[PDB]
Amino acid sequence: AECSVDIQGNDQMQFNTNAITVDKSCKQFTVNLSHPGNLPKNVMGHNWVLSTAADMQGVVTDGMASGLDKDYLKPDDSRVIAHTKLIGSGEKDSVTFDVSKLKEGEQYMFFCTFPGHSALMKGTLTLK
Ligand SMILES: [Cu+]
């Protein structure tokens, strides 16, 4: 099983994948995020945040109101399953989480919580 994925967030406010499949055989899953853009994190910062599809809107809404210093995430938000830090041009960050934090039959979404970015920077994640 392929238990990791490399993802990029760029200056065009786009991730380079719209869907991630996590194989059930995997015990852990790793996301390696990078920023090939030129813009700094205060204007084009990107993070990779995971939640159920149902909780996405709440996480995004409260994240925006949280500010840059809080990585645009509501402190201790229980709806966030896993997340990388917010990164800007030339930076990279990885996050590894336990696959047992996911279940079959539930739709998950990964997205960036920087203000306005989730309109384009989002995708599905599914355990199969
Ligand atoms: Cu972003």
PDB file of C-alpha atoms and ligand atoms in Angstrom:
ATOM      1  CA  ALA A   1       0.000   0.000   0.000  1.00  0.00           C
ATOM      2  CA  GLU A   2       1.107   3.600  -0.636  1.00  0.00           C
ATOM      3  CA  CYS A   3       0.860   5.183   2.796  1.00  0.00           C
ATOM      4  CA  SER A   4       1.950   8.723   1.923  1.00  0.00           C
ATOM      5  CA  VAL A   5       1.258  11.498  -0.559  1.00  0.00           C
ATOM      6  CA  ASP A   6       3.220  14.555  -1.691  1.00  0.00           C
ATOM      7  CA  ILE A   7       1.073  17.689  -2.159  1.00  0.00           C
ATOM      8  CA  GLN A   8       1.894  21.218  -3.347  1.00  0.00           C
ATOM      9  CA  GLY A   9       0.069  24.491  -2.713  1.00  0.00           C
ATOM     10  CA  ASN A  10       1.106  27.275  -5.112  1.00  0.00           C
ATOM     11  CA  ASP A  11       0.637  30.984  -5.961  1.00  0.00           C
ATOM     12  CA  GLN A  12      -2.419  30.129  -8.091  1.00  0.00           C
ATOM     13  CA  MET A  13      -4.197  29.125  -4.844  1.00  0.00           C
ATOM     14  CA  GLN A  14      -4.428  25.470  -5.895  1.00  0.00           C
ATOM     15  CA  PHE A  15      -3.339  22.143  -4.424  1.00  0.00           C
ATOM     16  CA  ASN A  16      -2.060  19.626  -6.973  1.00  0.00           C
ATOM     17  CA  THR A  17      -4.550  16.883  -6.085  1.00  0.00           C
ATOM     18  CA  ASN A  18      -8.312  16.877  -5.677  1.00  0.00           C
ATOM     19  CA  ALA A  19      -8.594  13.475  -4.033  1.00  0.00           C
ATOM     20  CA  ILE A  20      -6.628  11.261  -1.645  1.00  0.00           C
ATOM     21  CA  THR A  21      -7.312   7.582  -1.044  1.00  0.00           C
ATOM     22  CA  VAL A  22      -5.994   6.073   2.173  1.00  0.00           C
ATOM     23  CA  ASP A  23      -5.544   2.305   1.881  1.00  0.00           C
ATOM     24  CA  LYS A  24      -6.994   0.364   4.844  1.00  0.00           C
ATOM     25  CA  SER A  25      -3.788  -1.667   5.018  1.00  0.00           C
ATOM     26  CA  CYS A  26      -1.963   1.478   6.173  1.00  0.00           C
ATOM     27  CA  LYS A  27      -1.546   1.917   9.940  1.00  0.00           C
ATOM     28  CA  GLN A  28      -0.267   5.457   9.497  1.00  0.00           C
ATOM     29  CA  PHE A  29      -0.609   7.945   6.649  1.00  0.00           C
ATOM     30  CA  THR A  30       1.728  10.814   5.855  1.00  0.00           C
ATOM     31  CA  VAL A  31       1.117  14.025   3.905  1.00  0.00           C
ATOM     32  CA  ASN A  32       4.152  15.958   2.675  1.00  0.00           C
ATOM     33  CA  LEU A  33       3.148  19.530   1.814  1.00  0.00           C
ATOM     34  CA  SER A  34       5.376  22.010  -0.030  1.00  0.00           C
ATOM     35  CA  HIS A  35       4.967  25.514  -1.468  1.00  0.00           C
ATOM     36  CA  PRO A  36       6.546  26.025  -4.921  1.00  0.00           C
ATOM     37  CA  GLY A  37       5.184  29.574  -5.111  1.00  0.00           C
ATOM     38  CA  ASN A  38       7.001  32.894  -4.556  1.00  0.00           C
ATOM     39  CA  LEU A  39       4.530  34.499  -2.158  1.00  0.00           C
ATOM     40  CA  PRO A  40       5.049  34.565   1.653  1.00  0.00           C
ATOM     41  CA  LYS A  41       2.673  32.845   4.108  1.00  0.00           C
ATOM     42  CA  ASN A  42       1.018  36.088   5.151  1.00  0.00           C
ATOM     43  CA  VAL A  43      -0.415  36.595   1.640  1.00  0.00           C
ATOM     44  CA  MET A  44      -0.462  33.085   0.135  1.00  0.00           C
ATOM     45  CA  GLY A  45       0.063  30.772   3.101  1.00  0.00           C
ATOM     46  CA  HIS A  46      -1.144  27.195   2.848  1.00  0.00           C
ATOM     47  CA  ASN A  47      -1.844  24.402   5.289  1.00  0.00           C
ATOM     48  CA  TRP A  48      -3.291  20.920   4.802  1.00  0.00           C
ATOM     49  CA  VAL A  49      -6.137  20.377   7.264  1.00  0.00           C
ATOM     50  CA  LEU A  50      -8.279  17.253   7.536  1.00  0.00           C
ATOM     51  CA  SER A  51     -11.800  16.926   8.890  1.00  0.00           C
ATOM     52  CA  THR A  52     -14.980  15.083   8.027  1.00  0.00           C
ATOM     53  CA  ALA A  53     -16.809  16.672   5.070  1.00  0.00           C
ATOM     54  CA  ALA A  54     -19.563  17.526   7.550  1.00  0.00           C
ATOM     55  CA  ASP A  55     -17.224  19.572   9.781  1.00  0.00           C
ATOM     56  CA  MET A  56     -15.347  21.388   7.012  1.00  0.00           C
ATOM     57  CA  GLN A  57     -17.416  24.579   6.940  1.00  0.00           C
ATOM     58  CA  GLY A  58     -17.204  25.041  10.704  1.00  0.00           C
ATOM     59  CA  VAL A  59     -13.446  24.497  10.748  1.00  0.00           C
ATOM     60  CA  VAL A  60     -12.904  26.958   7.878  1.00  0.00           C
ATOM     61  CA  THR A  61     -15.208  29.640   9.293  1.00  0.00           C
ATOM     62  CA  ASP A  62     -13.716  29.582  12.778  1.00  0.00           C
ATOM     63  CA  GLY A  63     -10.207  29.250  11.351  1.00  0.00           C
ATOM     64  CA  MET A  64     -10.394  32.475   9.356  1.00  0.00           C
ATOM     65  CA  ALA A  65     -11.431  34.431  12.468  1.00  0.00           C
ATOM     66  CA  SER A  66      -8.453  32.991  14.341  1.00  0.00           C
ATOM     67  CA  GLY A  67      -5.717  34.979  12.598  1.00  0.00           C
ATOM     68  CA  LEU A  68      -2.260  34.298  11.163  1.00  0.00           C
ATOM     69  CA  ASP A  69      -0.622  33.819  14.574  1.00  0.00           C
ATOM     70  CA  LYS A  70      -3.042  30.944  15.193  1.00  0.00           C
ATOM     71  CA  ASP A  71      -2.305  29.384  11.791  1.00  0.00           C
ATOM     72  CA  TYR A  72      -5.895  30.205  10.837  1.00  0.00           C
ATOM     73  CA  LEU A  73      -7.258  27.425  13.035  1.00  0.00           C
ATOM     74  CA  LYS A  74      -9.562  27.582  16.038  1.00  0.00           C
ATOM     75  CA  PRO A  75      -7.395  26.660  19.067  1.00  0.00           C
ATOM     76  CA  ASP A  76      -7.871  23.024  20.097  1.00  0.00           C
ATOM     77  CA  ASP A  77     -10.585  22.527  17.450  1.00  0.00           C
ATOM     78  CA  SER A  78     -11.804  18.950  18.048  1.00  0.00           C
ATOM     79  CA  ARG A  79     -13.097  18.761  14.461  1.00  0.00           C
ATOM     80  CA  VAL A  80      -9.565  18.815  13.050  1.00  0.00           C
ATOM     81  CA  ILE A  81      -8.291  15.245  12.636  1.00  0.00           C
ATOM     82  CA  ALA A  82      -4.767  16.248  11.545  1.00  0.00           C
ATOM     83  CA  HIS A  83      -2.991  19.220   9.992  1.00  0.00           C
ATOM     84  CA  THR A  84       0.341  20.522   8.796  1.00  0.00           C
ATOM     85  CA  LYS A  85       1.494  23.983   9.781  1.00  0.00           C
ATOM     86  CA  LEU A  86       0.813  26.994   7.550  1.00  0.00           C
ATOM     87  CA  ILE A  87       3.698  27.442   5.096  1.00  0.00           C
ATOM     88  CA  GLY A  88       4.801  30.033   2.567  1.00  0.00           C
ATOM     89  CA  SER A  89       7.131  30.048  -0.437  1.00  0.00           C
ATOM     90  CA  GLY A  90       9.997  27.582  -0.281  1.00  0.00           C
ATOM     91  CA  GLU A  91       8.833  25.934   2.934  1.00  0.00           C
ATOM     92  CA  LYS A  92       7.613  22.379   3.524  1.00  0.00           C
ATOM     93  CA  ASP A  93       5.911  20.451   6.323  1.00  0.00           C
ATOM     94  CA  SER A  94       4.687  16.923   6.920  1.00  0.00           C
ATOM     95  CA  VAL A  95       2.053  15.340   9.114  1.00  0.00           C
ATOM     96  CA  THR A  96       1.591  11.677   9.942  1.00  0.00           C
ATOM     97  CA  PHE A  97      -1.632  10.440  11.548  1.00  0.00           C
ATOM     98  CA  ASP A  98      -3.113   7.102  12.584  1.00  0.00           C
ATOM     99  CA  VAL A  99      -5.369   5.545   9.956  1.00  0.00           C
ATOM    100  CA  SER A 100      -7.613   4.313  12.800  1.00  0.00           C
ATOM    101  CA  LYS A 101      -8.713   7.945  13.126  1.00  0.00           C
ATOM    102  CA  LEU A 102     -10.699   7.291   9.911  1.00  0.00           C
ATOM    103  CA  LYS A 103     -13.580   4.942   9.089  1.00  0.00           C
ATOM    104  CA  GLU A 104     -15.134   3.531   5.937  1.00  0.00           C
ATOM    105  CA  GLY A 105     -18.398   5.063   4.763  1.00  0.00           C
ATOM    106  CA  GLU A 106     -17.530   8.553   5.964  1.00  0.00           C
ATOM    107  CA  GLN A 107     -16.501  11.346   3.607  1.00  0.00           C
ATOM    108  CA  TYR A 108     -13.472  13.401   4.677  1.00  0.00           C
ATOM    109  CA  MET A 109     -12.137  16.641   3.224  1.00  0.00           C
ATOM    110  CA  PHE A 110      -8.676  18.178   3.243  1.00  0.00           C
ATOM    111  CA  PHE A 111      -8.422  21.936   2.722  1.00  0.00           C
ATOM    112  CA  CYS A 112      -6.405  25.065   3.434  1.00  0.00           C
ATOM    113  CA  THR A 113      -7.801  27.414   6.078  1.00  0.00           C
ATOM    114  CA  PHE A 114      -6.008  30.604   4.984  1.00  0.00           C
ATOM    115  CA  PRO A 115      -8.752  33.223   4.364  1.00  0.00           C
ATOM    116  CA  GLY A 116     -10.722  32.416   1.219  1.00  0.00           C
ATOM    117  CA  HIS A 117      -8.466  29.635   0.000  1.00  0.00           C
ATOM    118  CA  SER A 118     -10.812  26.717   0.661  1.00  0.00           C
ATOM    119  CA  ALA A 119     -13.048  27.884  -2.206  1.00  0.00           C
ATOM    120  CA  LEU A 120     -10.471  26.212  -4.493  1.00  0.00           C
ATOM    121  CA  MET A 121      -8.063  24.514  -2.073  1.00  0.00           C
ATOM    122  CA  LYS A 122     -10.049  21.495  -0.975  1.00  0.00           C
ATOM    123  CA  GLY A 123     -10.412  17.876  -1.936  1.00  0.00           C
ATOM    124  CA  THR A 124     -11.759  14.547  -0.793  1.00  0.00           C
ATOM    125  CA  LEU A 125     -10.050  11.944   1.376  1.00  0.00           C
ATOM    126  CA  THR A 126     -11.436   8.459   1.732  1.00  0.00           C
ATOM    127  CA  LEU A 127     -10.489   5.251   3.534  1.00  0.00           C
ATOM    128  CA  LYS A 128     -10.729   2.220   1.242  1.00  0.00           C
TER     129      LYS A 128
HETATM  130 CU    CU B   1      -3.838  28.347   1.212  1.00  0.00          CU
END
